[PDB]
Amino acid sequence: AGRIASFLKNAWAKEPVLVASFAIGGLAIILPSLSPYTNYAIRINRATPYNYPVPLRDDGNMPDVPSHPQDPQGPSLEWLKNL
Amino acid sequence: IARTFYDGPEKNYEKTMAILQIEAEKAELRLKELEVRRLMRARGDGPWYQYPTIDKALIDHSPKTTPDN
Ligand SMILES: CCCCCCCCCCCCCCCCC[C@@H](O)O[C@H](CO[C@H](O)CCCCCCCCCCCCCCC)COP(=O)(O)OCC[N+](C)(C)C
Numbered sequence: 001a002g003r004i005a006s007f008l009k010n011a012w013a014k015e016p017v018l019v020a021s022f023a024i025g026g027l028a029i030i031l032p033s034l035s036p037y038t039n040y041a042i043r044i045n046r047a048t049p050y051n052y053p054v055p056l057r058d059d060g061n062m063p064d065v066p067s068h069p070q071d072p073q074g075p076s077l078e079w080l081k082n083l
Numbered sequence: 084i085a086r087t088f089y090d091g092p093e094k095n096y097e098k099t100m101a102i103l104q105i106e107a108e109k110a111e112l113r114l115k116e117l118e119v120r121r122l123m124r125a126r127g128d129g130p131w132y133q134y135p136t137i138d139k140a141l142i143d144h145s146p147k148t149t150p151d152n
């Protein structure tokens with residue numbers, strides 16, 4: 001714990017470029033696993049409608065599927081407007 | 084000499100019968116296996132000579148952004 005401090009000081013005094021590069025790379029590696037907004041990025045990617053949504057045939061037993069785009073059923077994007 | 088070193092003729096006789104039966108059955112089985120191999124390789128309708136085809140489980144049965152696939 002004491003020799004590595006001297007090593008870090010010497011690296012900062014002799015090769016600052018490599019010190020900055022390693023610090024930036026380590027932050028870029030480890031930070032995304034600790035962020036709560038990564039799942040927000042996943043949801044935003046999933047909410048982009050590239051293709052046409054093909055309707056399902058009504059068999060009379062799907063109360064979770066809306067009968068109209070403005071019906072209360074189906075997914076909501078209200079979380080996206082507050083972001 | 085006969086009593087001390089040898090057996091009667093019936094032992095050799097019947098052992099020969101058993102040996103002949105085994106060998107004849109083996110020859111018939113060899114010929115049958117050759118014929119079965121020929122038929123199976125010609126028709127491909129048996130367990131042998133089954134060559135792989137594409138797995139149908141790899142197909143995606145989803146709407147494809149176009150109604151006509
Ligand atoms: C008495 C004088 C007048 C007559 C003389 C006759 C001469 C005969 C003696 C010479 C020996 C003949 C050759 C031996 C060949 C026989 C080998 C074999 O086939 O026999 C076996 C029998 O084994 C015997 O032990 C054979 C022993 C003979 C070996 C010869 C050794 C002689 C070496 C000399 C040493 C002398 C001293 C040395 C000083 C250093 C069969 O085993 P088994 O699975 O049951 O068969 C089933 C049949 N049954 C049911 C009838 C029993």
Ligand SMILES: CCCCCCCC/C=C/CCCCCCCC(=O)OC[C@H](COP(=O)(O)OCCN)OC(=O)CCCCCCC/C=C/CCCCCCCC
Binds near residue numbers: 018021029
């Ligand atoms: C608050 C603390 C900050 C903590 C930051 C993280 C750790 C920082 C220290 C880690 C290592 C720092 C640099 C290495 C130690 C000092 C440099 C050294 O070893 O000697 C210098 C010497 C170069 O000098 P010369 O060319 O030989 O000079 C010849 C003329 N005289 O270095 C070398 O020999 C090898 C250098 C290898 C460079 C690495 C290649 C690039 C990698 C960086 C890109 C991004 C990395 C991100 C991924 C890693 C994530 C952890």
